[PDB]
Amino acid sequence: GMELGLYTFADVNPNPADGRGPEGARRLRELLEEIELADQVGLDVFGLGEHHRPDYVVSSPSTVLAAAAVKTKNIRLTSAVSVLSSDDPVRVFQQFSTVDLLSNGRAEIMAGRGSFIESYPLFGYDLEDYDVLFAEKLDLLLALREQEVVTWSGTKHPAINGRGVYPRPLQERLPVWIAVGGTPQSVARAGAMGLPVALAIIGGEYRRFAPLFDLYHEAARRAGQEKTKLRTSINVHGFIADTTDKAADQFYGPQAEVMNRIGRERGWGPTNRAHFDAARGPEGNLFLGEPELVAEKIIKAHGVFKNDRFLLQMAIGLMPHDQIMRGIELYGTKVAPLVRKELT
Amino acid sequence: GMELGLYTFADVNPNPADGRGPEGARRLRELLEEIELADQVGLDVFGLGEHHRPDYVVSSPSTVLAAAAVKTKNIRLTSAVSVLSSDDPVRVFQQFSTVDLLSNGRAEIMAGRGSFIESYPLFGYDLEDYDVLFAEKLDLLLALREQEVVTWSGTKHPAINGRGVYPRPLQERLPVWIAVGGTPQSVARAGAMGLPVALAIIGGEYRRFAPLFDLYHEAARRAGQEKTKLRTSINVHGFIADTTDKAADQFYGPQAEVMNRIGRERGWGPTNRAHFDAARGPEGNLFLGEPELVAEKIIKAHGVFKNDRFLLQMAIGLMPHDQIMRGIELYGTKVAPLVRKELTG
């Protein structure tokens, strides 16, 4: 039925008192603790996103997921997202294949744009080439996973002339999800390819995205892709506490500081509590409150999307570790059983 | 003091009965057990080399070292080697900085040629470009470790215009070692740049390599590099077991396929017993035998090289896991104390 998981970018203080090294080490300590607890309370997936900024510690999700692999038993381990357009698909495949071996078949790649642009100047790419870079590198990533020895050529990556890529993973077909978007063009591309898609619901009302899944399914059905192979996920922000009032009070500040920073860099004004209270209402984008309320919204959202997977981002900005740990607990032991029993 | 460590390429059976996936999964589980034991018995360094072939499971040493980082306490964790010429130094720095954070300050990079010649086609390079690729990418890697925000340009890598590279590691200066095989040019360049060097001892009597370290120090002297920047290691093949005959038999046994690599690169065949026996004698390049024999050779080799670090590669070909585990135990509990007692006190 429904897969339930978590994802995070592993935020840090951009100006720590005792320097960026100790801050990073602390954050990664805490992050592993999050992943270990999520595994222990039976959550299905944990995602880590790639960023290239002083306020995030994870620029290499596969490296951190290798550590998670050997400290967990069941939880699936994915990027969320890999900014594939600015990386080398051979390296990405090798890294995730290695995580797959370390985790006994639990690795996945989620590839997409992300909402940040720091990777392009860092790695020497022009954003005007995003679409070609992503198309070619995704094509190459898919060729790599489909067989040991590949022959590939394009315009944006050197040719590969009948060479094996090692090591081979454990899974027959290492899963690759495409993170969209919210642009009809993006979902139809992925649909026509028969690839699973993950939709970030970032603001506004969640049901406004329903046509995107319609379009995904139509692009697939059109291209004669087998209905039953298609998977969909929604990736949302939110938080769970012992009461809805406590979830709201705890999440508001840490969350606002991040979403204000993002707005500044994208050209919009700061958030407020009224916007936040609207967002956490039944139709809003934020999946937030006591376990019962959050469970109810996940079930309702499924009525709308018929999504196979749901990923929740709670660890945002300077959310206290203890609060995140309690939220992960409540998500696994209270929210998940309610969702799972209704959707089975 | 003397740092004593291990390195491996994490060889697998290229013809596994139950498929490449399960073979790779088992090899990495076994490798982690090796590293954890090495940590537990107090060995100083563990290295993993990068290869791109069906008979090696580690094409991404940093990925595996991340896992080692969270399963160990004291051991330092290094590539051996990172084939830097064919990689992106920004990614390499980010990956090893991440290992550094996960390990609380225990990561290192050892950059070298490794098997570039076999693996350059995968990354789109031309063989001729090795020297400029290595020079520029090493220059970038060192720029990255020296400060948060860099401006760098060259001919074989895109420009970086005032960009930060994250996350920052824990160590003030992420150690970068240069692996050298015994070509004067490589050794001298490392010395002139004041970087620690790790020399591979392959073939003949180990003594014959000593002048290479002369050249390293002389290049450093004439470049006016600080004496205290300079560190040297020797990287050797060998094996430790409960008796010298057991070590020899187990290392030479046909089923382990060690000699197919060890003898081949030294210019002799897998059943050339005369050469293997000469190679493992007191002056030879193979550090092999019961613990007291191996410790005495390490001590003697120090009198020759004055090396700061000694790295041993035992886990080669299809050496049985149990035998490697016993060798690691003997290395940390018998060999290391003898060497440390004699060299330090």
XYZ file of C-alpha atoms in Angstrom:
689
model
C 0.000 0.000 0.000
C 1.292 3.451 1.103
C 5.018 4.017 1.782
C 5.679 6.562 4.502
C 8.986 8.325 4.933
C 11.041 11.374 5.799
C 13.433 13.653 3.961
C 15.708 16.527 5.019
C 18.433 18.811 3.703
C 20.339 18.708 6.999
C 20.218 22.446 7.767
C 22.902 24.020 9.926
C 23.531 27.440 11.459
C 25.239 29.439 8.623
C 27.221 31.343 11.301
C 28.081 28.902 14.126
C 29.896 30.347 17.150
C 32.536 27.595 17.180
C 33.084 27.274 13.424
C 31.604 25.356 10.537
C 33.469 22.060 11.199
C 32.129 21.370 14.738
C 28.655 22.534 13.580
C 28.718 20.127 10.598
C 29.948 17.211 12.766
C 27.153 17.821 15.300
C 24.516 18.023 12.543
C 25.643 14.758 10.908
C 25.657 13.032 14.354
C 22.026 14.159 14.848
C 21.075 13.225 11.299
C 22.259 9.643 11.692
C 20.262 9.542 14.948
C 17.169 10.666 12.975
C 17.678 7.953 10.369
C 18.370 5.205 12.990
C 15.200 6.152 14.932
C 13.136 6.229 11.699
C 14.360 2.695 10.872
C 13.587 1.528 14.434
C 10.003 2.841 14.471
C 9.358 1.212 11.042
C 9.289 4.143 8.612
C 9.801 3.084 4.993
C 12.077 5.644 3.337
C 14.570 8.328 4.332
C 15.731 10.939 1.782
C 18.649 13.406 1.904
C 18.879 16.380 -0.473
C 22.032 17.770 -2.125
C 22.950 21.482 -1.498
C 26.005 23.687 -1.984
C 25.648 26.415 0.631
C 26.927 27.275 4.101
C 23.496 26.558 5.672
C 23.351 22.869 4.645
C 25.796 20.087 5.518
C 24.828 17.575 2.797
C 26.496 18.313 -0.556
C 27.029 14.567 -1.118
C 23.857 12.587 -0.144
C 25.369 9.226 -1.247
C 28.311 9.652 1.167
C 25.991 10.195 4.134
C 23.578 7.447 3.037
C 26.531 4.951 3.071
C 26.897 5.710 6.813
C 23.122 5.326 7.305
C 23.241 2.012 5.423
C 25.428 0.295 8.001
C 23.459 1.723 10.995
C 20.009 0.560 9.740
C 18.244 -2.633 8.598
C 14.973 -1.909 6.751
C 14.493 1.733 5.855
C 15.069 2.609 2.175
C 17.715 5.240 1.525
C 17.376 7.820 -1.270
C 18.652 11.197 -2.378
C 15.938 13.907 -2.309
C 17.218 15.218 -4.613
C 20.336 14.433 -6.560
C 20.964 17.503 -8.795
C 21.843 15.129 -11.616
C 22.216 17.852 -14.291
C 25.452 19.102 -12.665
C 26.990 15.704 -11.737
C 28.608 12.787 -13.564
C 26.023 9.984 -13.921
C 28.822 7.338 -13.848
C 29.927 8.616 -10.402
C 26.333 8.916 -9.197
C 25.606 5.341 -10.270
C 28.837 4.031 -8.625
C 28.096 5.869 -5.378
C 24.460 4.714 -5.123
C 25.361 1.189 -6.255
C 27.886 1.151 -3.384
C 25.183 2.358 -0.943
C 23.001 -0.440 -2.411
C 25.645 -3.054 -1.576
C 26.309 -1.587 1.926
C 22.518 -1.576 2.644
C 21.720 -4.983 1.116
C 19.441 -3.587 -1.642
C 17.894 -0.456 -0.111
C 19.355 2.439 -2.210
C 17.434 4.770 -4.557
C 18.102 7.921 -6.559
C 15.642 10.797 -6.781
C 16.862 13.151 -9.543
C 15.656 16.626 -10.293
C 16.186 20.332 -10.454
C 15.816 21.115 -6.805
C 14.938 24.712 -6.021
C 18.534 26.022 -5.721
C 21.091 27.125 -8.293
C 24.498 27.058 -6.533
C 25.624 23.817 -8.264
C 25.834 25.403 -11.709
C 28.553 28.037 -11.000
C 30.376 25.562 -8.772
C 30.556 22.830 -11.423
C 30.875 25.012 -14.539
C 27.398 24.709 -16.099
C 25.057 27.304 -17.624
C 21.463 27.147 -16.371
C 20.396 27.853 -19.972
C 21.410 24.240 -20.566
C 19.386 22.690 -17.712
C 16.981 20.771 -19.952
C 19.648 19.188 -22.194
C 21.984 18.455 -19.232
C 19.171 16.675 -17.356
C 17.819 14.780 -20.408
C 21.260 13.504 -21.403
C 22.460 12.666 -17.902
C 19.202 10.893 -17.028
C 19.444 8.890 -20.313
C 23.011 7.915 -19.419
C 22.011 7.052 -15.752
C 19.232 4.801 -17.060
C 21.614 3.068 -19.549
C 24.072 2.415 -16.683
C 21.473 0.741 -14.492
C 20.058 -1.385 -17.337
C 23.251 -3.450 -17.958
C 26.883 -3.884 -16.950
C 28.617 -2.738 -20.155
C 27.446 0.444 -21.860
C 27.961 2.382 -25.033
C 26.645 5.955 -24.848
C 27.307 9.307 -26.487
C 25.795 12.799 -26.391
C 26.667 16.496 -26.381
C 27.044 17.224 -22.649
C 29.060 14.283 -21.329
C 32.037 12.370 -22.795
C 31.308 9.188 -24.708
C 31.479 5.719 -23.168
C 32.631 3.050 -25.606
C 31.710 -0.434 -24.400
C 32.901 -0.165 -20.798
C 31.584 -1.854 -17.687
C 30.651 0.260 -14.699
C 31.374 -1.201 -11.232
C 30.379 -2.256 -8.751
C 26.999 -3.682 -9.847
C 24.252 -3.079 -7.312
C 22.206 -5.740 -5.511
C 18.806 -4.624 -6.832
C 17.979 -5.811 -10.328
C 16.969 -2.290 -11.219
C 18.190 0.448 -8.858
C 15.150 2.738 -8.563
C 15.359 6.222 -10.092
C 12.581 8.684 -9.282
C 12.139 12.037 -10.989
C 11.421 14.985 -8.720
C 9.008 17.413 -10.413
C 8.232 20.398 -10.731
C 4.641 21.521 -10.902
C 5.098 22.290 -14.587
C 2.918 20.135 -16.907
C 5.921 19.790 -19.219
C 8.032 18.095 -16.494
C 5.434 15.457 -15.478
C 4.551 14.525 -19.079
C 8.237 13.976 -19.911
C 8.517 11.553 -16.969
C 5.170 9.924 -17.755
C 6.144 9.249 -21.375
C 9.324 7.568 -19.966
C 7.373 5.424 -17.436
C 9.487 6.669 -14.516
C 8.120 7.138 -10.971
C 7.594 10.793 -10.026
C 7.833 12.745 -6.799
C 5.964 16.020 -6.557
C 7.072 18.701 -4.068
C 3.977 20.459 -2.645
C 5.649 23.610 -1.349
C 2.980 26.314 -0.854
C -0.699 27.014 -1.549
C -3.416 24.373 -1.402
C -2.420 20.781 -2.098
C -5.330 19.812 -4.386
C -4.229 22.398 -6.991
C -1.604 19.824 -7.998
C -4.130 17.070 -8.786
C -4.081 17.845 -12.576
C -0.311 17.215 -12.600
C -0.880 13.562 -11.689
C -3.672 13.403 -14.263
C -1.209 14.679 -16.856
C 1.483 12.204 -15.710
C -0.965 9.300 -16.126
C -2.166 10.616 -19.520
C 1.393 11.071 -20.871
C 2.078 7.472 -19.824
C -1.233 6.016 -21.138
C -0.594 7.954 -24.371
C 2.970 6.623 -24.751
C 1.509 3.171 -23.942
C 3.400 2.835 -20.681
C 2.036 0.081 -18.412
C -0.270 1.708 -15.802
C 0.757 -0.652 -13.033
C 4.498 0.178 -13.344
C 3.846 3.861 -12.510
C 4.542 5.172 -8.990
C 3.869 8.607 -7.537
C 4.872 10.412 -4.352
C 4.178 13.729 -2.704
C 6.994 15.420 -0.782
C 5.649 17.884 1.791
C 6.710 19.956 4.796
C 5.150 19.388 8.212
C 5.588 18.343 11.792
C 3.977 16.054 14.387
C 3.719 16.627 18.135
C 1.598 15.332 21.017
C -0.924 18.146 20.384
C -1.790 20.279 17.362
C -1.105 23.513 19.352
C 2.353 22.238 20.321
C 3.150 21.187 16.722
C 2.219 24.659 15.490
C 4.168 26.586 18.144
C 7.297 24.422 17.812
C 7.396 24.413 14.003
C 6.443 28.035 13.214
C 9.675 29.922 14.073
C 12.314 27.500 12.696
C 10.216 26.999 9.565
C 9.558 30.733 8.963
C 13.289 31.602 9.122
C 13.996 29.176 6.278
C 11.000 30.019 4.081
C 11.756 33.784 4.491
C 15.366 33.191 3.377
C 14.098 31.223 0.363
C 11.545 33.966 -0.485
C 14.316 36.610 -0.346
C 16.362 34.688 -2.877
C 13.351 33.992 -5.148
C 11.834 37.491 -4.999
C 8.907 37.233 -2.553
C 8.089 38.734 0.886
C 8.308 37.014 4.297
C 5.693 34.541 5.582
C 3.445 35.199 8.612
C 1.408 33.241 11.156
C -1.835 33.816 9.215
C -0.227 32.294 6.086
C 1.103 29.484 8.320
C -2.299 28.886 9.946
C -3.828 28.733 6.459
C -1.088 26.314 5.310
C -1.729 23.910 8.204
C -5.517 23.943 7.636
C -7.086 20.853 6.003
C -6.524 22.030 2.382
C -3.124 23.712 2.965
C 0.327 22.378 2.003
C 1.607 21.774 5.612
C 1.047 18.341 7.110
C 1.078 19.438 10.730
C -0.526 18.681 14.096
C -1.247 15.819 16.488
C -0.860 12.297 14.951
C -4.624 11.898 14.300
C -4.870 15.127 12.295
C -1.766 14.456 10.193
C -2.921 10.858 9.518
C -6.323 12.208 8.393
C -4.710 14.638 5.927
C -2.404 11.917 4.464
C -5.486 9.729 3.852
C -7.439 12.665 2.316
C -4.480 13.589 0.098
C -4.398 9.965 -1.105
C -8.091 10.259 -2.056
C -6.992 13.127 -4.327
C -3.609 11.895 -5.663
C -3.743 8.096 -5.339
C -0.020 8.444 -4.419
C 2.032 5.336 -3.552
C 4.511 7.201 -1.329
C 4.454 10.176 1.059
C 7.655 11.930 2.247
C 7.577 14.415 5.086
C 10.188 17.093 5.785
C 10.185 18.084 9.480
C 13.880 18.780 10.141
C 14.007 22.330 8.661
C 16.269 25.190 9.869
C 17.161 25.124 13.525
C 14.349 22.797 14.722
C 15.616 21.363 18.059
C 16.928 17.801 17.704
C 14.812 16.560 20.658
C 11.628 17.870 18.989
C 12.529 16.233 15.671
C 13.245 12.909 17.441
C 9.840 13.003 19.205
C 8.201 13.883 15.841
C 9.892 10.928 14.100
C 8.688 8.663 16.931
C 5.067 9.887 16.655
C 5.234 9.611 12.851
C 6.332 5.931 13.037
C 4.308 4.715 16.013
C 1.074 6.762 15.754
C 0.634 8.357 12.302
C 1.847 5.394 10.205
C -0.370 2.645 11.743
C -3.468 4.858 11.258
C -2.594 5.493 7.603
C -1.590 1.820 6.954
C -4.775 0.337 8.412
C -7.069 2.626 6.402
C -5.213 2.084 3.100
C -5.139 -1.766 3.172
C 56.436 7.713 16.048
C 55.679 5.159 13.375
C 52.111 4.902 12.113
C 51.153 1.338 11.111
C 48.248 0.614 8.847
C 46.533 -1.490 6.208
C 45.250 -0.854 2.691
C 43.226 -2.926 0.213
C 41.516 -2.718 -3.158
C 38.674 -4.986 -1.972
C 39.136 -7.699 -4.643
C 36.183 -9.896 -5.532
C 35.689 -13.064 -7.530
C 35.169 -11.851 -11.103
C 33.231 -15.147 -11.733
C 30.936 -15.414 -8.673
C 28.583 -18.393 -8.469
C 25.574 -16.344 -7.310
C 26.062 -13.079 -9.227
C 28.056 -9.843 -8.938
C 25.563 -8.163 -6.584
C 25.689 -10.767 -3.766
C 29.476 -11.149 -4.232
C 29.946 -7.312 -3.845
C 27.572 -7.164 -0.820
C 29.516 -9.939 0.943
C 32.882 -8.364 0.088
C 31.844 -5.010 1.583
C 30.439 -6.660 4.739
C 33.795 -8.471 5.107
C 35.727 -5.246 4.405
C 33.829 -3.384 7.134
C 34.686 -6.230 9.527
C 38.395 -5.821 8.545
C 38.294 -2.052 9.231
C 36.434 -2.415 12.526
C 38.913 -5.046 13.731
C 41.876 -2.877 12.667
C 40.350 -0.026 14.689
C 39.743 -2.289 17.713
C 43.286 -3.664 17.776
C 44.774 -0.178 17.569
C 46.116 0.064 14.003
C 46.644 3.677 12.910
C 45.426 3.917 9.316
C 43.223 2.032 6.889
C 43.260 2.780 3.122
C 40.888 1.794 0.286
C 41.938 2.077 -3.368
C 39.820 3.134 -6.339
C 39.430 0.678 -9.264
C 37.040 0.329 -12.251
C 36.994 -3.399 -13.056
C 34.763 -6.395 -12.393
C 37.265 -7.851 -9.937
C 37.206 -4.895 -7.476
C 34.210 -3.637 -5.540
C 35.596 -0.171 -4.546
C 35.250 2.334 -7.366
C 34.236 4.943 -4.755
C 36.542 4.780 -1.695
C 34.956 7.843 0.020
C 31.509 6.144 -0.061
C 32.861 3.059 1.716
C 35.027 5.162 4.162
C 31.801 6.955 5.223
C 30.438 3.624 6.412
C 33.786 2.805 8.111
C 33.668 6.243 9.821
C 30.500 5.412 11.814
C 31.741 1.939 12.783
C 35.142 3.021 14.162
C 36.708 5.279 16.787
C 40.479 5.834 16.345
C 41.727 4.598 13.002
C 42.460 7.128 10.294
C 40.560 6.594 7.057
C 42.200 7.283 3.669
C 41.885 6.579 -0.019
C 44.903 4.543 -1.315
C 44.580 5.868 -3.927
C 42.074 8.385 -5.231
C 42.781 8.530 -9.018
C 42.443 12.285 -8.807
C 43.299 13.021 -12.494
C 40.026 11.434 -13.649
C 37.776 12.871 -10.917
C 36.364 16.282 -10.008
C 38.462 17.736 -7.117
C 35.385 19.657 -5.865
C 33.472 16.367 -5.462
C 36.489 14.581 -3.986
C 36.921 17.370 -1.441
C 33.203 17.344 -0.548
C 33.122 13.570 -0.186
C 36.223 13.356 2.033
C 35.129 16.476 4.032
C 31.872 14.561 4.691
C 33.878 11.489 5.840
C 35.924 13.866 7.998
C 32.742 15.127 9.686
C 31.288 11.617 10.123
C 34.627 10.396 11.623
C 35.244 13.429 13.850
C 38.478 14.457 12.052
C 39.981 11.150 10.813
C 39.818 11.464 6.951
C 42.696 11.732 4.463
C 43.129 11.662 0.697
C 46.010 9.827 -1.005
C 46.082 10.978 -4.610
C 47.909 9.056 -7.302
C 48.058 7.490 -10.733
C 46.632 4.095 -9.630
C 45.241 2.344 -12.696
C 44.393 5.528 -14.625
C 45.632 3.864 -17.824
C 42.940 1.218 -17.605
C 40.158 3.588 -16.373
C 40.598 6.937 -18.249
C 38.266 5.807 -21.098
C 35.354 5.681 -18.641
C 35.773 9.385 -17.823
C 36.487 10.651 -21.333
C 40.177 11.572 -20.929
C 43.179 11.038 -23.216
C 46.153 9.129 -21.702
C 48.598 11.886 -22.767
C 46.791 14.415 -20.599
C 47.626 12.647 -17.308
C 50.369 15.079 -16.145
C 48.375 18.321 -16.702
C 45.186 16.705 -15.318
C 47.022 15.670 -12.169
C 48.855 18.968 -11.758
C 45.768 21.170 -12.200
C 43.425 18.981 -10.158
C 45.906 18.629 -7.328
C 46.356 22.454 -7.488
C 42.526 22.834 -7.227
C 42.219 20.281 -4.373
C 44.860 22.160 -2.352
C 43.121 25.518 -3.042
C 39.829 24.027 -1.789
C 41.267 22.793 1.468
C 42.987 26.146 2.203
C 39.821 28.276 2.438
C 36.056 28.254 2.164
C 35.599 30.448 -0.928
C 37.864 29.936 -3.958
C 38.657 31.497 -7.314
C 40.522 29.041 -9.534
C 41.009 28.553 -13.271
C 43.015 26.190 -15.509
C 42.902 24.394 -18.843
C 41.473 20.935 -17.974
C 38.737 21.850 -15.452
C 36.019 24.539 -15.449
C 36.731 27.862 -13.697
C 35.383 28.580 -10.217
C 34.562 32.230 -9.659
C 34.441 33.072 -5.929
C 32.309 30.106 -4.826
C 32.121 28.431 -1.386
C 32.633 24.648 -1.178
C 30.645 22.874 1.554
C 30.640 21.232 4.004
C 33.893 22.380 5.604
C 35.817 19.520 7.247
C 36.711 19.256 10.903
C 40.518 19.074 10.514
C 42.231 22.454 9.937
C 43.930 21.037 6.828
C 42.519 17.843 5.307
C 45.678 15.717 4.835
C 46.559 15.103 1.196
C 49.295 12.539 0.450
C 50.811 11.891 -2.956
C 51.257 8.215 -3.947
C 54.367 7.621 -6.041
C 55.659 4.449 -7.765
C 59.348 5.217 -8.073
C 59.683 7.640 -10.952
C 61.968 10.536 -9.909
C 59.698 13.193 -11.438
C 56.656 12.347 -9.299
C 58.694 12.101 -6.100
C 60.550 15.397 -6.704
C 57.368 17.248 -7.518
C 55.764 16.119 -4.209
C 58.877 17.322 -2.284
C 59.011 20.695 -4.100
C 55.324 21.165 -3.135
C 56.013 20.104 0.444
C 53.363 17.312 0.435
C 53.731 13.947 2.280
C 54.582 11.068 -0.068
C 53.691 7.359 -0.048
C 56.056 5.138 -2.018
C 54.875 1.783 -3.469
C 57.646 -0.844 -2.954
C 57.196 -3.208 -5.883
C 59.894 -5.660 -7.015
C 63.490 -6.320 -5.996
C 65.076 -5.423 -2.696
C 63.322 -2.694 -0.781
C 66.737 -1.029 -0.183
C 66.936 -0.004 -3.832
C 64.086 2.522 -3.303
C 65.843 4.484 -0.534
C 67.433 7.082 -2.918
C 63.903 8.135 -3.988
C 63.400 9.584 -0.524
C 66.766 11.427 -0.964
C 65.312 13.054 -4.027
C 62.080 13.967 -2.182
C 64.031 15.693 0.629
C 66.481 17.365 -1.802
C 63.613 18.731 -3.902
C 62.091 20.001 -0.661
C 65.417 21.528 0.495
C 65.921 23.381 -2.830
C 62.278 24.595 -2.817
C 62.792 25.716 0.787
C 59.878 23.668 2.167
C 59.486 23.259 5.954
C 61.086 19.993 7.173
C 58.027 19.364 9.340
C 55.607 19.456 6.406
C 57.385 16.422 5.050
C 56.068 12.925 5.813
C 56.941 9.650 4.139
C 55.210 6.294 3.971
C 56.058 2.984 2.375
C 53.188 0.955 0.905
C 54.015 -2.749 0.632
C 52.418 -6.129 0.007
C 52.607 -8.923 2.537
C 50.851 -11.090 5.069
C 51.086 -12.031 8.766
C 50.155 -15.450 10.181
C 50.883 -17.571 13.217
C 53.971 -19.093 11.562
C 56.149 -17.971 8.669
C 55.354 -21.148 6.679
C 51.629 -20.608 7.220
C 51.953 -17.006 6.045
C 53.902 -18.084 2.925
C 51.615 -21.064 2.102
C 48.405 -19.095 2.607
C 49.658 -16.114 0.538
C 51.062 -18.334 -2.287
C 48.189 -20.909 -2.332
C 46.693 -21.332 -5.876
C 43.102 -20.896 -4.635
C 43.768 -17.350 -3.261
C 45.072 -16.139 -6.678
C 47.374 -13.644 -4.958
C 50.390 -14.424 -7.216
C 48.422 -13.558 -10.413
C 48.671 -9.897 -9.329
C 51.749 -9.887 -7.007
C 54.077 -11.852 -9.273
C 52.683 -10.458 -12.507
C 53.590 -6.829 -11.723
C 57.062 -7.841 -10.471
C 57.768 -9.772 -13.715
C 57.343 -13.369 -12.547
C 54.754 -16.134 -12.856
C 52.407 -17.358 -10.091
C 54.361 -20.594 -9.544
C 57.791 -18.972 -9.635
C 58.675 -20.147 -6.106
C 62.316 -19.020 -6.443
C 61.181 -15.412 -7.005
C 58.474 -15.439 -4.307
C 60.936 -16.908 -1.812
C 63.515 -14.272 -2.698
C 60.829 -11.547 -2.476
C 59.805 -12.536 1.078
C 63.429 -12.927 2.387
C 64.964 -10.244 4.700
C 65.864 -7.827 1.865
C 62.868 -8.496 -0.387
C 59.833 -6.332 -1.035
C 57.213 -8.713 0.505
C 56.650 -8.122 4.262
C 55.579 -11.652 5.109
C 55.842 -14.171 7.962
C 55.168 -14.751 11.638
C 54.740 -11.538 13.700
C 58.341 -11.244 14.977
C 59.761 -11.636 11.439
C 57.468 -8.984 10.000
C 58.123 -6.584 12.928
C 61.882 -6.959 12.462
C 61.598 -6.158 8.748
C 59.464 -3.034 9.508
C 62.112 -1.940 12.032
C 64.967 -2.587 9.562
C 63.096 -0.809 6.767
C 62.752 2.219 9.052
C 66.561 2.305 9.502
C 66.762 2.517 5.707
C 63.865 4.906 4.879
C 63.192 6.794 8.133
C 59.571 6.554 7.086
C 56.766 8.009 9.287
C 54.166 5.556 8.132
C 54.022 1.876 7.013
C 51.003 0.544 5.088
C 50.535 -3.178 4.436
C 48.259 -4.722 1.755
C 47.351 -8.319 2.747
C 43.744 -8.684 1.534
C 44.543 -9.491 -2.134
C 42.704 -11.656 -4.693
C 40.623 -14.388 -3.085
C 42.497 -14.573 0.261
C 40.021 -16.202 2.665
C 38.358 -13.715 5.066
C 39.237 -15.783 8.192
C 42.946 -15.671 7.305
C 42.867 -11.878 6.758
C 41.018 -11.388 10.079
C 43.689 -13.468 11.914
C 46.426 -11.440 10.120
C 44.846 -8.162 11.229
C 44.594 -9.392 14.826
C 48.277 -10.466 14.798
C 49.269 -7.185 13.117
C 47.623 -5.004 15.833
C 48.343 -7.166 18.863
C 51.850 -8.556 18.174
C 53.563 -6.769 15.298
C 52.589 -3.159 16.176
C 53.684 -3.282 19.866
C 57.104 -4.738 18.881
C 57.647 -2.011 16.266
C 56.405 0.812 18.504
C 58.536 -0.410 21.457
C 61.722 -0.514 19.379
C 61.233 2.731 17.421
C 59.603 4.909 20.080
C 59.935 3.236 23.494
